Amino acid sequence: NLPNLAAAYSSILSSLGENPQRQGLLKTPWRAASAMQFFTKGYDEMVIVKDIDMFSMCEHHLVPFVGKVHIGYLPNKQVLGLSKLARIVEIYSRRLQVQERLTKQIAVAITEALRPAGVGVVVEATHMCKTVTSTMLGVFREDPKTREEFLTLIR
Amino acid sequence: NLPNLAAAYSSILSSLGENPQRQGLLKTPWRAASAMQFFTKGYDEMVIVKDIDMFSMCEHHLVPFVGKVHIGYLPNKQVLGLSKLARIVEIYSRRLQVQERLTKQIAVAITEALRPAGVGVVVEATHMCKTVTSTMLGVFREDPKTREEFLTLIR
Amino acid sequence: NLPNLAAAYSSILSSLGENPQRQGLLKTPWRAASAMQFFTKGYDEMVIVKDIDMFSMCEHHLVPFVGKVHIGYLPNKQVLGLSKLARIVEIYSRRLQVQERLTKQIAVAITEALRPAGVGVVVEATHMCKTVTSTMLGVFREDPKTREEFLTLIR
Amino acid sequence: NLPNLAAAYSSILSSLGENPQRQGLLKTPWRAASAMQFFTKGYDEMVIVKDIDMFSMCEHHLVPFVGKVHIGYLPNKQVLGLSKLARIVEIYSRRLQVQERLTKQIAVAITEALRPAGVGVVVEATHMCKTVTSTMLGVFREDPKTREEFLTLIR
Amino acid sequence: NLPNLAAAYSSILSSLGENPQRQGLLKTPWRAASAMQFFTKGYDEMVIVKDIDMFSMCEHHLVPFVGKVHIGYLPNKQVLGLSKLARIVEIYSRRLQVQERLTKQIAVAITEALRPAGVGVVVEATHMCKTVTSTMLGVFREDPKTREEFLTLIR
Amino acid sequence: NLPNLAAAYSSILSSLGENPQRQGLLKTPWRAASAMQFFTKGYDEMVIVKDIDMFSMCEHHLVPFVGKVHIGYLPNKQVLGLSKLARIVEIYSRRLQVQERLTKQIAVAITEALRPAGVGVVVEATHMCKTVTSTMLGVFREDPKTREEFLTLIR
Amino acid sequence: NLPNLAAAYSSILSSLGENPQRQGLLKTPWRAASAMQFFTKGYDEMVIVKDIDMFSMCEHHLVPFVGKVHIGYLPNKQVLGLSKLARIVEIYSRRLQVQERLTKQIAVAITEALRPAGVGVVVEATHMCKTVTSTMLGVFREDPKTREEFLTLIR
Amino acid sequence: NLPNLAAAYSSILSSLGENPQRQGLLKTPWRAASAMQFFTKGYDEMVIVKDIDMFSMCEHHLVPFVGKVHIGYLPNKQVLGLSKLARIVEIYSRRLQVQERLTKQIAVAITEALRPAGVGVVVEATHMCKTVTSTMLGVFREDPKTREEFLTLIR
Amino acid sequence: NLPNLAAAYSSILSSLGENPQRQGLLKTPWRAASAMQFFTKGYDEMVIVKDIDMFSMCEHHLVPFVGKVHIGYLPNKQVLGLSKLARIVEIYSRRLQVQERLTKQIAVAITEALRPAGVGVVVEATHMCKTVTSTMLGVFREDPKTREEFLTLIR
Amino acid sequence: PYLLISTQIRMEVGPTMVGDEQSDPELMQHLGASKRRALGNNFYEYYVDDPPRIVLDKLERRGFRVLSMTGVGQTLVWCLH
Amino acid sequence: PYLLISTQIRMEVGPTMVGDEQSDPELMQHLGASKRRALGNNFYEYYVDDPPRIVLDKLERRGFRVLSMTGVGQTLVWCLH
Amino acid sequence: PYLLISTQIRMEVGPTMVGDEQSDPELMQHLGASKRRALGNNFYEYYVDDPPRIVLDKLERRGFRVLSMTGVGQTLVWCLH
Amino acid sequence: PYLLISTQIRMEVGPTMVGDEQSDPELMQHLGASKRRALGNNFYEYYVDDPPRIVLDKLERRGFRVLSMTGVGQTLVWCLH
Amino acid sequence: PYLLISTQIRMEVGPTMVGDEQSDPELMQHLGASKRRALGNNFYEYYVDDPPRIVLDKLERRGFRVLSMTGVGQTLVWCLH
Ligand SMILES: C[C@H](O)[C@H](O)C1=Nc2c(nc(N)[nH]c2=O)NC1
Ligand SMILES: C[C@H](O)[C@H](O)C1=Nc2c(nc(N)[nH]c2=O)NC1
Ligand SMILES: C[C@H](O)[C@H](O)C1=Nc2c(nc(N)[nH]c2=O)NC1
Ligand SMILES: C[C@H](O)[C@H](O)C1=Nc2c(nc(N)[nH]c2=O)NC1
Ligand SMILES: C[C@H](O)[C@H](O)C1=Nc2c(nc(N)[nH]c2=O)NC1
Ligand SMILES: C[C@H](O)[C@H](O)C1=Nc2c(nc(N)[nH]c2=O)NC1
Ligand SMILES: C[C@H](O)[C@H](O)C1=Nc2c(nc(N)[nH]c2=O)NC1
Ligand SMILES: C[C@H](O)[C@H](O)C1=Nc2c(nc(N)[nH]c2=O)NC1
Ligand SMILES: C[C@H](O)[C@H](O)C1=Nc2c(nc(N)[nH]c2=O)NC1
Ligand SMILES: [Zn+2]
Ligand SMILES: [Zn+2]
Ligand SMILES: [Zn+2]
Ligand SMILES: [Zn+2]
Ligand SMILES: [Zn+2]
Ligand SMILES: [Zn+2]
Ligand SMILES: [Zn+2]
Ligand SMILES: [Zn+2]
Ligand SMILES: [Zn+2]
């Protein structure tokens, strides 16, 4: 599928009124094809993990959007590694997304991994085509002390 | 109506004690007429869209005011695009406004577009003739956890 | 009363061990007299008006104090102009004040002008002889959601 | 000329497709006429005076621009008051300007007032239709120690 | 001279249209008289002493101005205490000053105390009636490496 | 007792392996004795007074600690001067203290001076041998709106 | 055990494809052995002690992690020294840890030392292999005024 | 060599007085062995590339150090890709280094790749066992305008 | 000499009007004696080492002063370790100092250790009884490019 | 049989809500209730301009009696059977 | 028939409010109530300086009895029939 | 015998919860309750789409009667015996 | 006749307040109450070291009975007639 | 005679506390209560794993009856006599 992408980018370079055979556009169908395969390669205490860098692709305009994910949770019996929370990020972010589904998908992946007391997921991101989306599940929604402990520590 | 504006700006330049026929005021009735037509050309999770740049015209002194709109909402069934929330801004801001009506109009446009659970609209702006106006509709008004989640994430 | 002030400042310059007839103190009784006459020349949504610059005179030591007033209110039927809130400031600030009475006087002037739901007035100022005084009237005192909406947006 | 302006703003309100006889546009030809008359009412050591607030009118689009002037000078025999440097600002800024002429005019007014060793004028401003213009006259141009002393202290 | 000041402030309170016999203006002629007597009670390596707080009285309008003094010097044989440089400040600042003479006076007092290689004095201050004045004496004026070492370390 | 201190500091200089008779340690028993006598010379609206500078002596290691006191209170009938709150600070700080007693002592002095509705005292300080201690008395402890109004305005 | 570590680091230097006998790797088995022995050498008012610097070793990858501990407590009868709270930190941090156990261990050590009303421990840290963990014990968990007083003062 | 490292880390865990067979230290010899193999896996205009993130291993104490590299160069005939300058970084940083050799090695790799007019390399980094090292080669050393253009743009 | 200090601090506690036998002053002569023994326990490229924390004792008033040392040097044949530059700091700072001698002493210790091309030492510190002292030796004094490379990188 | 009326935190002042979309239009007519949709709400409601104690005197004459008063949030709710 | 009195969160100390603008002026006279308009409020109210338990002893002698006590916010409200 | 139903702060609008995992499936069938697991919750629950006052009219016909209504958080809970 | 006792949010642990400045000194003597002025408060109060349920067993033997328990803030108040 | 049980804000799910340090060990034995000291608390308590409505069915068979349910904080407290 790598030659199938590279033929599709060479037809983009011709359709824009640009010369695909010049100094600077020889490996451009092939450098950009291996770019889009990288950009879609995903297919009792409170533990807040913040500043999680995110780089996803908009599924409407196929142009990236760049942001941060904030995750906090209250475990019951099973805790999760701080490097595994980031690979749950990279699986759902390195896809063709919207920010609204990307927030909800991360919360569901942590919910089913651990069955915790509560999950809070906050994704802020800049769409090049900031917006904050926020799921509050479990006891991050029912308790005011628990939601407000999350929201002060992430900043 | 573009010659009707340009004749009205040439009578402004004469009334101020200024010479409308000099180096620097030849296209001034016509550059300013196409300026005022640009400046009035508008006639389960939380999704906060902040830093929305606004440039409206005061309807009292016909002098601009410059600010930011903060919008957050809780959807029920229908979500709205992040580029469509900004065009709802530009339709009501690029008019002859007051900040107090401009806040209330944006909240009503999102309320009728989606029928969400709650709407929060916050407009801060500097009047050259900062002031914060704020509508809290739906469950942003009845719930203290929901209003305070909005007000921490927008800053 | 302008010669009556200027004779009183010329007696100040003599009492300090200073020579009132030198290079630099000729118009000083008259420049300072017109300074003290300028410095005492005052005798459904939330609308927060912040960063209101204030320059009042201490009535104890006759030395200025410099600060900011933060006003927010919830209207019922009658709203007030954003340039009229600032002239209510300048009438009560350009007097011989204390900060504690200056806070309470601004809240009463807005209360009687509009009869709103609630009034919040916060004056921070540096006394050269910061201190924050704060009146919370109406539903800014009874509601915790309404007082806390005021206190996050003013900063 | 105040009725001559107010008749020219009432023809603007009609030409924009707007109703000049409604709630909110009754005093608008007369409030805006007294706005444009205010906005055009101007017709051995180093002393740097910075943060001088400026509010001028663009002469191309008749829309304001907002900025700061930085003035420094090296006197020879005659120094100038720090309140007189600001009225030299307000005379040339409260006109129909460009930023490039407004910089050069302030430097010439201080040059002829004092005949100093050197004059440095720096105007940064945001045009709503930042840009830095900078005149360096006298020994602010010939000396590298003198220009660089100016440029570090203004920031 | 303390009753001579207090009689001069009681004539100020009467001339402003204010009642000198009320709750809040009984000790005001005497509290302000002891305020103006406090406010005028002043009558091989590089050593930079910065952030020296200053509180002087304008001699034109008799209203304070508030600032910072930056002093650096290159000694020859005699160094000066870091608490004595601050009392040289307080002697010349607690007077009726202009900022331009206050800069030049501090440099002369350090020059005659030590006879150093060079003296640099920088006073920035806000006049309530910022401006930077700057004397560079000795080898702070002739050397570009020495003036620029001073100007980077003070910030 | 000033010769009794100065003999006790001269025995300190000898016990440290240092020569008390050299260039730089002649007035050191007497300059430091008058330092320790200075350092121990202390023996309806909300009014928050913040940024109160504090310089106390640790009573364990006899080494200073440096901090800020934040005081707010709700008066009943009697208010207190803003210069008298600072002298209540200097009486209890210029002693041999701990931060925990210094917080509690300031709150008791204001409580007995005024009998107010509530007292809030917050002392942050750096111990050279930050820590925040905080007394909340009266209605700063029972009301959540009143404690949270204090804690947002002090920052 | 110091020669037993140094022989284990010399086998690391050989296994990485590196020459253990060169300019720069002679004392490297012995400098690093005394590094790992230092890095594991640990085996009525509110008193918040913040900015407590922490340097612990990850027990998974044997690579450090660097952070800050925030401790606050409400005493009953027995208070604890501000230098003893930091040695409780250094005993549990200078070990092979996880951040989640390091938070819980500090809270238990203060709980058993004093039996206070409540304990709040917040550890933020950067793992080189930020994350906030937070235990709230006692009346920092049951009271909303007490948890929120802790969380505003630590920032 | 991966079992040879993992046996060397299991002898570290025993020598520290720690139990290598417990909950939390089972994969620790093998997780840390694959960490040290990752951490040592490296064996006419001005183009400044700044903020280049660096993560190197100290060769003295085998503990990381974390910093930023700033590279600027003046090409002659051959320019270099902005992703190739970063792989020159990662080859020399992901080794057992000192900061002083790591600066000099990056400058030599760019010098031989391009033969440019001048090379400037600045590495600031925090050693956990900031320090700025700086090579200036070519016309970044001989010209004062060229070195100072580099040093203002990197900040 | 530890009982000789502790008897000298017990005579300080009596001379201040304080009761040396109370709750809180039992170990105070002995805790403070071991404090003063800790506080006086000291008796081709550019390598800038900044942010070196310093804690010295003033020799005039026996009260600490707290600051930072910035050291940069150009080696000839012999370089110096980055942990040895900090122990040269701690030897001369943990004494009874003035800042002016403490700057000059650090530069001489590095000069004799290495004989480099140039030495630059900058000590900023706050005296509790900021001031910047600065020695520039060697080619940091003769070259303007070399002094200015030092002074931009340290900030 | 059951009827839930509510006010805000100052029960000296109204409005006091008296019913929902399917409430009895005869009994709302005796209480003097208007029917509005406040902005942001997705439902209709009845309301009067009176304090709650006046309405509790009215509903007493129609054979109701307060079971339980309670407060939820800033709201104060009366249950009448 | 119904009568709603209220205090703040420390019920040891007053004031306790006893009525609104249309409350019975004979029964407010027996309780010793003054009538004020506090600043920022757009309504009148009655109030006494007593604790609420003293007033509950007074209202018991006039044929009232507490149905339900509840707390809304910092306020504590008693309903008497 | 006891049965705890609850709603949110606007009791004009539903949903009102009616039971837990071990509630009576005949009585939940008469109330029209669905059974869901909301996301983030580790338990099942019954719920209807009605306001709480409609459900209080239904449960009255099955021999229940409200003991006490109270509000905890934003929730308003009825206890029926 | 009326008597208002209160505790904090964990009702397993005391102290529970039992009276104000004008409370009955015989009945406070049977409950074992001390009388203090806590700092910042401008009033006196009675208090015991017991949990509230022990005090509710004591007051039952003196002819009282709980009308209504409610919670205001972090406080939980019992009203006994 | 009095017995105070409590749960958190979702009363569908437990645990529900049933007693303090001096509670009846026969009645705690019938309810199936364990006794723990949670960390940070300076007192012992009894608790079961059931929802509160199951426990209210158990305590009904031992001659208790709910006087008043109320909510304080996130807690919901039942008083049984
Ligand atoms: C019921 C409650 O939400 C839950 O048990 C807990 N909440 C919290 C917790 N820990 C912290 N830090 N914050 C909480 O809100 N541990 C337990
Ligand atoms: C009833 C409640 O207000 C509403 O259902 C929700 N609130 C919230 C929500 N999500 C967030 N993040 N915050 C809320 O306050 N989802 C649902
Ligand atoms: C009762 C309530 O305080 C009042 O009706 C309102 N409050 C608010 C409001 N609008 C905002 N933004 N915030 C409030 O707290 N509108 C109405
Ligand atoms: C020749 C020189 O430019 C001129 O005489 C002066 N320059 C300076 C001065 N003062 C300062 N601060 N800086 C100068 O550059 N005084 C005199
Ligand atoms: C001639 C020269 O200006 C003078 O001798 C010196 N200058 C300097 C100095 N020290 C510093 N830090 N900087 C100078 O510019 N010592 C001596
Ligand atoms: C009962 C209440 O705590 C007290 O009467 C007041 N509180 C407040 C007040 N004023 C302000 N700003 N904030 C309060 O919390 N005035 C009165
Ligand atoms: C019951 C309550 O939590 C406890 O008694 C106290 N809380 C507090 C206190 N002091 C402060 N500052 N804040 C509290 O929340 N002292 C006592
Ligand atoms: C000789 C000189 O150093 C060299 O030719 C150039 N220098 C520079 C350059 N471009 C920039 N921006 N800056 C220089 O210093 N181009 C050419
Ligand atoms: C002569 C000159 O000062 C000296 O040889 C050098 N200077 C410098 C140098 N390296 C840097 N970065 N900067 C200099 O100024 N290496 C050599
Ligand atoms: Zn897109
Ligand atoms: Zn306007
Ligand atoms: Zn004053
Ligand atoms: Zn323009
Ligand atoms: Zn002046
Ligand atoms: Zn100490
Ligand atoms: Zn790790
Ligand atoms: Zn190292
Ligand atoms: Zn000193």
Numbering used by the authors:
A (entry chain F), B (entry chain G), C (entry chain H), D (entry chain E), E (entry chain D), F (entry chain I), ...: 67 to 109, 127 to 212, 224 to 249
J (entry chain Q), K (entry chain R), L (entry chain P), M (entry chain S), N (entry chain T): 2 to 82
The authors write:
Structures of the inhibitory (EM_hGCH1-hGFRP+BH4) and the stimulatory (EM_hGCH1-hGFRP+Phe+active) hGCH1−hGFRP complexes were generated using single-particle cryo-EM. For the inhibitory complex, an hGCH1−hGFRP−BH4 ternary complex was produced by mixing the components (GCH1, GFRP, BH4) and purification via size exclusion chromatography (SEC). The inhibitory and stimulatory protein complexes were reconstructed applying D5 symmetry, yielding maps with resolution of 2.9 and 3.0 Å, respectively, which allowed building of atomic models. Comparison of the cryo-EM−derived inhibitory and stimulatory GCH1−GFRP complexes reveals a significant increase in the density of the EM map at the core of the GCH1 decamer involving the central five-helix bundle and the 20-stranded β-barrel (region C) as a result of allosteric ligands and GFRP binding. Helices approach each other by moving more than 1 Å, and the β-barrel diameter is reduced by 2 Å. Secondly, the EM structures reveal a drastic difference between the inhibitory and stimulatory hGCH1−hGFRP complexes in the structure and flexibility of the surface-lining loop 115 to 130 (region A). We do not see any major differences between the cryo-EM structure of the BH4−GFRP-inhibited GCH1 and the X-ray structure of cpd-1−inhibited GCH1. Comparison of the inhibitory GCH1−GFRP−BH4 complex with allosterically inhibited GCH1 shows that binding of GFRP does not change the overall conformation of GCH1 significantly.
Guanosine triphosphate (GTP) cyclohydrolase I (GCH1) (EC:3.5.4.16) catalyzes the conversion of GTP to dihydroneopterin triphosphate (H2NTP). This reaction is the first and rate-limiting step involved in the de novo synthesis of tetrahydrobiopterin (BH4). The effects of GFRP on GCH1 occur via formation of heteromeric protein complexes between GCH1 and GFRP, which are dependent on the intracellular concentrations of the effector molecules phenylalanine or BH4.
